[PDB]
Design a binder for this molecule. Structure first.
Ligand SMILES: Nc1ncnc2c1ncn2[C@@H]1O[C@H](COP(=O)(O)OP(=O)(O)O)[C@@H](O)[C@H]1O
Ligand SMILES: Nc1ncnc2c1ncn2[C@@H]1O[C@H](COP(=O)(O)OP(=O)(O)O)[C@@H](O)[C@H]1O
Lengths: 266, 270
């Protein structure tokens, strides 16, 4: 059985699709395979907020559910529904997709089409949270609006910023078009390159090209060319205007305080 | 520093006015303030095409450049120039306005009256695009001719139909404001849903004027919900259909035609 989709973020609606695939495969006595289309079509348009994560991180999460195969957007956008089925679905009896699934040139292929070709299509209903349908777009907007505390309810976890490399650390996220947080300062949970978990204050600013710098707390080693994962816990304050230290000093007090509070709640 | 004008649409010319204000504010280590006049005098005269957007939308765009304040055209058209300066410009050493700037009783107030009061005034030359001077009036006319594809070079973005939601087609209620109407017909649109989701739609403009949109690859009730729609292309003229079957034919072709254009847009990227 094969589920097909982008699964950007692998949010709770996506997990819904993937768990249903596994169950479907169980009762069908078939193997499970996930086809993840590298980029949604909107990805190439100017106003695209950006992906929640890299295709690589994504595959790494999809992989926790089943064999995951990346369908390369450039390699499929021009295929006919038939061409698509023949090349990626030969010998596939069932595909699990979200509602209004589309494929092939001019989004001409749909669940109906797949059915007329003998493939049975399980169309999973979107998960709704707080009267809202879970989806990459919705989550992508919260990231842009800096509403990072509201994300877990839709994403299934905290939005994460990842990459390589008072002092502060510059997180290069890669050449991928990823969504950017609202300019500003955040309280983040920093996963270190050794199971170490610390807290940091993160600034997101320009120079067009949003930057992500993080001041880790109770840390002092050289992280340079090392990877870094940061759970974005809360939006502290909007971006601001050499009294810099003064403000970037209260941020740390604010950090310690929030941190101290989480702890108090035994 | 203060900027003053109607700014219907916040087109690129308006944007040149506003950015200039911010550059001057930065230069002087001062604050910016935008005064947007509710309506141009034409809004109350014969044959006004209508605004490009509501004051409410306008102030939302304006507010991203700086603290904004609306001025009732009626609460100021009667004021004498002096009065205007007396009520709105105290302490202000710089104003940035477009060309043909006017204010006060019988449009007697101008940049000259303002410069002669110690207030420096910077009139920004209209922006020229494709040999034409960018103006709200010019854009209103394109919308009217449905020439929606040529709009962004002037407006700086696609024209928008915005409103409350009144096969299935979502009915957009634009509000009670006097808005410019698109040339009746069928358009391909980019629908911005509440979630923050973007789909494409096929919009129909009929005949007041009716705005109907069928959102593609979408299922859901949208009553009382606000939709913003970028009008991307004019697909075809309105067309009468005697038999009701010829309609579905066309409707079907429309969604189809939309999907093709949508594919073209996506591939135009390379
Ligand atoms: N407490 C810390 N928090 C973040 N980075 C640190 C810390 N201590 C040392 N570093 C390291 O210091 C370097 C950042 O150096 P610096 O030039 O001072 O700042 P930046 O490059 O962000 O402008 C990185 O390689 C980073 O891994
Ligand atoms: N794909 C869609 N496009 C437009 N509206 C849709 C779509 N799917 C569901 N709807 C919903 O259907 C309703 C439109 O209903 P209907 O009365 O049949 O349309 P109309 O009278 O304008 O032809 C709205 O509540 C709308 O949100």
């Amino acid at each position: 059985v094969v589920s097909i989709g982008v699964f950007d973020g692998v949010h709770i609606g996506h997990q819904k699709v993937l768990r249903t695939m596994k169950e479907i495969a169980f009762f069908r006595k078939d193997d499970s395979l996930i086809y993840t289309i590298s980029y949604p079509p909107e990805y190439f348009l100017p106003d695209f907020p950006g992906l929640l994560m890299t295709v690589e991180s994504r595959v790494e999460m999809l992989s926790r559910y089943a064999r995951t195969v990346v369908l390369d957007f450039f390699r499929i956008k021009d295929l006919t529904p038939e061409g698509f089925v023949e090349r990626y679905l030969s010998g596939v009896s069932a595909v699990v997709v979200g509602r209004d699934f589309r494929f092939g040139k001019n989004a001409s292929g749909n669940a109906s089409f797949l059915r007329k070709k003998g493939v049975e299509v399980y169309e999973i209903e979107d998960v709704v949270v707080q009267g809202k349908r879970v989806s990459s777009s919705l989550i992508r907007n919260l990231v842009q609006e800096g509403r990072v505390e509201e994300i877990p309810a839709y994403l299934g976890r905290y939005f994460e910023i990842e990459g390589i490399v008072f002092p502060t650390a510059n997180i290069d996220r890669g050449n991928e078009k990823l969504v950017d947080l609202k300019r500003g300062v955040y309280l983040v949970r920093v996963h270190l390159p050794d199971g170490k978990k610390k807290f940091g204050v993160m600034n997101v600013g320009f120079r067009r090209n949003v930057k992500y710098e993080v001041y880790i707390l109770d840390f002092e080693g050289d992280l340079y060319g090392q990877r870094l994962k940061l759970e974005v816990l809360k939006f502290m304050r909007d971006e601001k205007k050499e009294e810099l230290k003064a403000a970037i000093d209260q941020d740390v007090k604010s950090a310690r305080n929030m941190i101290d509070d989480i702890i108090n709640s035994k």
